Design an enzyme around this catalytic site. Structure first.
Site, PDB file in Angstrom:
ATOM      1  N   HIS A   1       0.859  -1.217   0.000  1.00 21.96           N
ATOM      2  CA  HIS A   1       0.000   0.000   0.000  1.00 21.96           C
ATOM      3  C   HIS A   1       0.887   1.257   0.000  1.00 21.96           C
ATOM      4  CE1 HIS A   1      -3.133  -3.008   1.267  1.00 21.96           C
ATOM      5  NE2 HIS A   1      -3.810  -2.297   0.376  1.00 21.96           N
TER       6      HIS A   1
ATOM      7  N   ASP B   1      -4.769   5.745  -1.083  1.00 23.53           N
ATOM      8  CA  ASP B   1      -4.158   4.969   0.031  1.00 23.53           C
ATOM      9  C   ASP B   1      -3.202   5.841   0.869  1.00 23.53           C
ATOM     10  OD1 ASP B   1      -5.442   2.481   0.251  1.00 23.53           O
ATOM     11  OD2 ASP B   1      -4.253   1.616  -1.349  1.00 23.53           O
TER      12      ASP B   1
ATOM     13  N   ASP C   1      -7.880  -0.593  -8.188  1.00 19.73           N
ATOM     14  CA  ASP C   1      -7.260  -0.894  -6.882  1.00 19.73           C
ATOM     15  C   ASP C   1      -6.702  -2.318  -6.899  1.00 19.73           C
ATOM     16  OD1 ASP C   1      -6.335  -0.475  -4.392  1.00 19.73           O
ATOM     17  OD2 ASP C   1      -8.247  -0.684  -3.375  1.00 19.73           O
TER      18      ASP C   1
HETATM   19  C1  II5 Z   1     -11.740 -10.709   0.860  1.00 17.31           C
HETATM   20  N1  II5 Z   1     -10.624 -11.533   0.429  1.00 17.31           N
HETATM   21  C2  II5 Z   1      -9.361 -11.105   0.478  1.00 17.31           C
HETATM   22  O1  II5 Z   1      -9.060  -9.912   0.632  1.00 17.31           O
HETATM   23  C3  II5 Z   1      -8.267 -12.129   0.255  1.00 17.31           C
HETATM   24  C4  II5 Z   1      -7.057 -11.915  -0.349  1.00 17.31           C
HETATM   25  N2  II5 Z   1      -6.711 -10.669  -0.903  1.00 17.31           N
HETATM   26  C5  II5 Z   1      -5.723 -10.472  -1.835  1.00 17.31           C
HETATM   27  O2  II5 Z   1      -5.029 -11.373  -2.304  1.00 17.31           O
HETATM   28  C6  II5 Z   1      -5.632  -9.071  -2.341  1.00 17.31           C
HETATM   29  N3  II5 Z   1      -6.389  -8.162  -1.695  1.00 17.31           N
HETATM   30  C7  II5 Z   1      -6.387  -6.890  -2.135  1.00 17.31           C
HETATM   31  C8  II5 Z   1      -7.251  -5.945  -1.343  1.00 17.31           C
HETATM   32  C9  II5 Z   1      -8.260  -6.442  -0.344  1.00 17.31           C
HETATM   33  C10 II5 Z   1      -6.983  -5.870   0.134  1.00 17.31           C
HETATM   34  C11 II5 Z   1      -5.623  -6.476  -3.223  1.00 17.31           C
HETATM   35  C12 II5 Z   1      -4.850  -7.403  -3.897  1.00 17.31           C
HETATM   36  C13 II5 Z   1      -4.839  -8.735  -3.473  1.00 17.31           C
HETATM   37  N4  II5 Z   1      -4.064  -9.734  -4.075  1.00 17.31           N
HETATM   38  C14 II5 Z   1      -2.987  -9.570  -4.980  1.00 17.31           C
HETATM   39  C15 II5 Z   1      -2.576 -10.579  -5.847  1.00 17.31           C
HETATM   40  N5  II5 Z   1      -1.597 -10.415  -6.748  1.00 17.31           N
HETATM   41  C16 II5 Z   1      -1.022  -9.216  -6.757  1.00 17.31           C
HETATM   42  N6  II5 Z   1      -1.325  -8.170  -5.984  1.00 17.31           N
HETATM   43  C17 II5 Z   1      -2.295  -8.366  -5.094  1.00 17.31           C
HETATM   44  C18 II5 Z   1      -6.361 -13.128  -0.302  1.00 17.31           C
HETATM   45  N7  II5 Z   1      -7.074 -14.052   0.319  1.00 17.31           N
HETATM   46  N8  II5 Z   1      -8.251 -13.430   0.660  1.00 17.31           N
HETATM   47  C19 II5 Z   1      -9.279 -14.176   1.398  1.00 17.31           C
HETATM   48  C20 II5 Z   1     -10.103 -15.088   0.505  1.00 17.31           C
HETATM   49  O3  II5 Z   1     -11.113 -14.330  -0.118  1.00 17.31           O
HETATM   50  C21 II5 Z   1     -12.049 -15.051  -0.919  1.00 17.31           C
HETATM   51 MG    MG Z   2      -6.955   1.187   0.616  1.00 17.49          MG
HETATM   52 ZN    ZN Z   3      -5.257   0.551  -2.847  1.00 14.57          ZN
END
Ligand code: II5
Ligand code: MG
Ligand code: ZN
Length: 316
Positions: A69, A108, A218
């Site tokens: 972030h 952010d 995002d």
């Molecule tokens: C709500 N879920 C989840 O936020 C969640 C995950 N979030 C991310 O991976 C992720 N989140 C954000 C945002 C939410 C914070 C942005 C990028 C992400 N990934 C990524 C992959 N490649 C490269 N850059 C980034 C992982 N597991 N869960 C639970 C399982 O959920 C179904």
């Molecule tokens: Mg944010």
């Molecule tokens: Zn962001």
């Protein structure tokens, strides 16, 4: 003056037009890249270059040295918005072009790498101040602060009521990056699109669509070439795990995505995240904005890459 155009090296000039563009490892180049995107999507007359550069460097100063972030993420999210704007140029007002790139840059601000849930359990003062979308209201608050510094009002030429509209575009855009809000917003846009009710002249409908564009921007790290997407996943888990550590220090079990003792289930976790969050996100956005197709395609491609990782045909 308007005789001074920002330009990129040839590879960047061409590839910045691609949704999957990576802004590179040279931090010094990112302000130049953002200004270039503002000039081509908004115009060279949208902002006083001196104010913009001062505003950009203050925003950069108020990003923290966190794994994900950070300042690179802000520009990356701005770049994805730029790509959405360039390929849907007919659909946006002057205020929206102006305001959305800036919302992406600021969305952010002052992130320390901790979710809204951690601030609630920690009893961070920001959680008394802002009971929901806590970080996101802080991001906006920080944006306004920076605008009110001397020589930083990039919106100085706008009428009192335009300035108010553009700040409300920015505020709602930043609030929309609270993923707790995205699920509701995407469901609503999904029903609205299928029923034929969706109406881009309806302001509350515009708000929803800009919110989904902000979700898509995002999350756009899942829409890059695989090497970028896989390397960037390390950075987000670095934060998730640091937060799980802090949850454990409060004597609270973190949810699985933030437990570093579950590092081996990252491919499983990613598969879960793409099916539940990313794919639906870019699917709904592709329905509403057909030219945003490549985001969905590159998302499905990276899903298939995670599937490959699960079955041991790929390493991470
Ligand atoms: C709500 N879920 C989840 O936020 C969640 C995950 N979030 C991310 O991976 C992720 N989140 C954000 C945002 C939410 C914070 C942005 C990028 C992400 N990934 C990524 C992959 N490649 C490269 N850059 C980034 C992982 N597991 N869960 C639970 C399982 O959920 C179904
Ligand atoms: Mg944010
Ligand atoms: Zn962001």
């Amino acid at each position: 003056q308007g005789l001074m155009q920002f330009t990129l090296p040839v590879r960047l000039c061409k590839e910045i037009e691609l949704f999957h563009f990576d802004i590179g490892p040279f931090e010094n180049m990112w302000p130049g890249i953002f200004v270039y995107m503002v000039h081509r999507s908004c115009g060279t007359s949208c902002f006083e270059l001196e104010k913009l550069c001062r505003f950009i460097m203050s925003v950069k100063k108020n990003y923290r040295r966190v794994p994900y972030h950070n300042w690179k993420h802000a520009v990356t999210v701005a770049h994805c918005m730029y790509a959405i704007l360039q390929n849907n140029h007919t659909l946006f007002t002057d205020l929206e072009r102006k305001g959305l790139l800036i919302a992406c840059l600021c969305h952010d601000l002052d992130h320390r790498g901790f979710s809204n849930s951690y601030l609630q359990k920690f009893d961070h003062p920001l959680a008394a101040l802002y009971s929901t979308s806590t970080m996101e209201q802080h991001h906006f608050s920080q944006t306004v602060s920076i605008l009110q510094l001397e020589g930083h009002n990039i919106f100085s030429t706008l009428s009192s009521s335009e300035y108010e509209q553009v700040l409300e575009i920015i505020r709602k855009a930043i609030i929309a990056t609270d993923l707790a809000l995205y699920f509701g917003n995407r469901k609503q846009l999904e029903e609205m699109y299928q029923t034929g009710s969706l109406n881009l002249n309806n302001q509350s409908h515009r708000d929803r669509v800009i919110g989904l564009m902000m979700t898509a921007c995002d999350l756009c790290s899942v829409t890059k070439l695989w090497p970028v997407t896989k390397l960037t996943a390390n950075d987000i888990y670095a934060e998730f795990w640091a937060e799980g550590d802090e949850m454990k220090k409060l004597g609270i079990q973190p949810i699985p995505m933030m437990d570093r003792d579950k590092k081996d289930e990252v491919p499983q976790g990613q598969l879960g995240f793409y099916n539940a969050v990313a794919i639906p996100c870019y699917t709904t956005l592709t329905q509403i904005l057909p030219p945003t197709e490549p985001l969905l395609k590159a998302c499905r491609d990276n899903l298939s890459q995670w599937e490959k990782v699960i079955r041991g045909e790929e390493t991470a």
